[PDB]
Design a protein around this ligand. Structure first.
Ligand SMILES: CN1CCN(CCCN2c3ccccc3Sc3ccc(C(F)(F)F)cc32)CC1
Ligand SMILES: CN1CCN(CCCN2c3ccccc3Sc3ccc(C(F)(F)F)cc32)CC1
Ligand SMILES: CN1CCN(CCCN2c3ccccc3Sc3ccc(C(F)(F)F)cc32)CC1
Ligand SMILES: CN1CCN(CCCN2c3ccccc3Sc3ccc(C(F)(F)F)cc32)CC1
Ligand SMILES: [Ca+2]
Ligand SMILES: [Ca+2]
Lengths: 83, 82
């Protein structure tokens, strides 16, 4: 619940910005959630080269429903975790 | 100030930001991020910054007054956004 705090401190504008980013990363996604596939595309689009294992790691750190995918709520937590 | 946070960054993190930097200037006139490239990157990530806001973002870290972001200033931009 340490990160749950920082997400509640985010303004509606900040959340709307992340939603716009989230919305573009899920294009193609079957269920409308970031899967390792989508995450890998965003990262590579940003010049990174992650492995399947590293991608599953990033997702697992915020996968609170155990879906193996990131939904917008878990995504806001991913951003806040950065720092 | 921020120069301290940049000195803390590992060589691996800098190389990661560098890889991002290199993709953001692909086609840059002077090999640096100008408002054109900065807006391009942000639009791609679903944002819609104004010309005035893009200039502010550059200026906040433009320590040489070129109106563009070189890699050194880019690492500040990454860090400064804390
Ligand atoms: C090998 N291993 C691969 C990944 N890197 C960290 C990448 C962090 N990251 C990042 C950093 C600099 C430039 C581009 C990117 S892409 C990216 C996208 C989302 C996230 C997100 F979701 F977290 F916010 C973090 C990152 C660490 C080492
Ligand atoms: C409090 N506030 C919380 C969020 N952080 C910014 C997180 C953004 N982010 C990130 C996080 C950790 C390490 C590297 C990166 S680069 C990066 C690249 C793309 C995205 C992408 F694609 F998602 F947009 C998000 C991020 C700033 C401070
Ligand atoms: C209207 N005005 C538009 C811009 N927003 C801030 C956007 C911050 N940002 C961001 C946040 C969520 C999703 C995508 C992006 S693109 C982006 C790229 C670089 C930076 C960087 F370099 F700064 F770290 C910050 C951002 C503030 C208000
Ligand atoms: C020390 N460490 C330095 C970097 N910051 C994270 C910067 C990530 N970032 C950012 C910063 C502020 C607000 C929003 C965002 S989203 C975002 C999108 C793209 C990039 C970009 F440019 F890479 F593509 C960088 C960022 C976390 C702490
Ligand atoms: Ca999930
Ligand atoms: Ca400059």
């Amino acid at each position: 619940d340490i990160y749950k705090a920082a997400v509640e401190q985010l303004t509606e504008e900040q959340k709307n910005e992340f939603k716009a980013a989230f919305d573009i990363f899920v294009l193609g996604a079957e269920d409308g959630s970031i899967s390792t596939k989508e995450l890998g595309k965003v990262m590579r689009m940003l010049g990174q080269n992650p492995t399947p294992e590293e991608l599953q790691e990033m997702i697992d750190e915020v996968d609170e429903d155990g879906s193996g995918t990131v939904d917008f709520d878990e995504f806001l937590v991913m951003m806040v975790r950065s720092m």
